[model samples]
Target: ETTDTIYLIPEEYEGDLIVVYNVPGAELLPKEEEFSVVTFAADGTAVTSTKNMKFGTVNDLYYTVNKEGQRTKIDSSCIHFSSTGSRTENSWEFPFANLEVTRTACSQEFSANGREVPENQEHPAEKKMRDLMQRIQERYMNKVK
Candidate 1:
């Protein structure tokens, strides 16, 4: 399966911070592509592993991958980001967050999954929703640095 991708470069980053995303349904793909995104500041000063629960419009899904490749879903509406200071030596501020998420089980491919959503089935609605989520991911990626 093929899907869109976003890359954040440390060289091109001008801002003191960069935000990247990992959307749900990414686990259905191959390994080389699994959400291993990395963003580097222009001077390679700060690097943090980024994860977003929900993104884009109110209905999108956020994803996080564990060291063992387990993907977790997060609820976005409950959290927010706020800027804190000027560009001092440690000017980057990621301080305040009221983030909340109602944890959900990852969708399963089995029949008894209780009306669970099947990912990448190629239906129109699924495609549309997936595209919307990916759009948000790309939108965030475009803010590199």
Candidate 2:
């Protein structure tokens, strides 16, 4: 069993950032090569450990080791970089103030900035109704003013 999947890592990362690999309707494959970890700045620019060339101004740098054991460059969309939660020192500002991921027997919960956000699914009808109510309240307040 061979794979073309690429794995990237942040060198300064300090949490249970698990990068699980899965393929739809297929058995899991064994790890054949070591991960290519890139040391990155707060702004997301990267420097590779094996190759000395700069990765330029980018957030998520990635690479892959082919069947011939040759290093090949790849894009960010090829892999999923999952983490427990990471806070950076640089001037990079994420959209959320805080993020948490919880895995259960049957469900996964993700929260940001003290609010729970839908993950891998659509927003519930109740949330839609709440948003609608908020809009209506704002409209009424504007009219009253």
lDDT of each: 0.30, 0.29
Query: Poorest 10 consecutive residues of model 1 by lDDT?
Result: 94-103
Best by lDDT: 1
Which residue segments of model 1 deviate by more than 4 Å? Answer: 1-61, 84-86, 90-145
Residues 10-80 of candidate 1 have per-residue lDDT tens digits of: 32222122232232222221223434333223332222223332223333234443444455443332122
Tell me the lDDT of candidate 1. Answer: 0.30
| Per-residue alpha-carbon lDDT of candidate 2 for residues 1-145, written as tens digits (9 for 90 to 100) | 2223233333332112222111112123223353234322222222121211112333433444434445555433333333222222233211111111122211222221222446877534334334533443354334442
| Model 2 Cα shift for residue 138 (angstroms) | 58
Question: Each prediction's TM-score against the native?
Answer: 0.22, 0.21
TM-score of 2: 0.21
Residue 53: error of model 1 in Å? 18
